[PDB]
Each structure stands twice: as C-alpha cells, then as structure tokens.
Amino acid sequence: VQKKNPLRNKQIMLRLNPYASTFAKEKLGEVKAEEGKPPKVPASFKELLHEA
Amino acid sequence: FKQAANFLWPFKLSNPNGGFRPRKFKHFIEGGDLGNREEHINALIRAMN
C-alpha cells in the first residue's frame, strides 16, 4: 500500500539486504588502504609531465 | 544483463535539484548538457534522483 525508501527507512533496508547491518557494524565504507611505504614518482614521469 | 535491464522498468526521474546549465539543449563539451559527459553523469543522477 506504500512504497518505502530503503535509504531512509532502515527496516526495509534490512528486509531487502540482511548484510546492511554487518556492513554498518564492520565499517566497510571506511576500509583503510594497505600499509607500506609508497615508491616515489620516477624522474622521467615528472620530466614528461613538465615538458614544454 | 539484457533480462535484468528489460525487467527493470524505465526510471522516472525528477528534475535536477540546482537545475541544468544556462543553455541546456547543447552538447556537454560546448557548455550544455546533451551528449556523453562520461563520469560526470553521476552528479546529474544525484540531482535527478
């Protein structure tokens, strides 16, 4: 009798998708990147980037 | 994908919140809204939805 929005009414969200509670609890929208020192930019890349 | 998309009824969006560009019936490259805007379609989807 009434279409309810899953993005607003969380009960319909858990009806359509039971994994929503696990998503919100485990914070899968805030997953940090893998650790490790990032390699620097190669000099040829910057030279081509700033080449006239 | 064909069966899923044909099962999905065509989406009836509302008008964009914030409107269109000043001249809408013109290509997106020229400064309008028609044509392929590539990844910029998402802001239009949030405005129209």
């Binding site: 994994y19 696990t22 998503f23 899968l28 390699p39 930019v41 | 590539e38 379609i41």
Partner: protein, 50 residues
C-alpha cells in the same frame, strides 16, 4: 547474506586492483590504459514535440 558479502568484497577488490595496475605501470615507467566502459545510463532530457 553470503552473496552480498561476496559482492562487496568483489567491488572493493576491483577498485584496488585498478588503482594497483595504474600505480605499477606508472612506477615501471609506462601507462596503463583502463578498460573502456561497458555500462552507460541514458537519460532523455528533451520533449516529445517536433
């Protein structure tokens, strides 16, 4: 439930894999061309007159 968990994991892995391929190409001194898009969303924004 298990299927949605698998789908979320697959989306995250695809995103990080695209970023990783771009980064390793940049570090090896080349250019990674990403795949052309397979999905488009078409919106009709003009009327039905003339």
């Amino acid at each position: 439930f298990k299927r949605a968990e698998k789908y979320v994991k697959e989306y995250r892995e695809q995103e990080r894999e695209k970023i990783r391929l771009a980064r390793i190409a940049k570090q090896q001194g080349s250019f990674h061309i990403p795949a052309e898009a397979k999905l488009v969303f078409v919106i009709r924004i003009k009327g039905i007159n003339k």
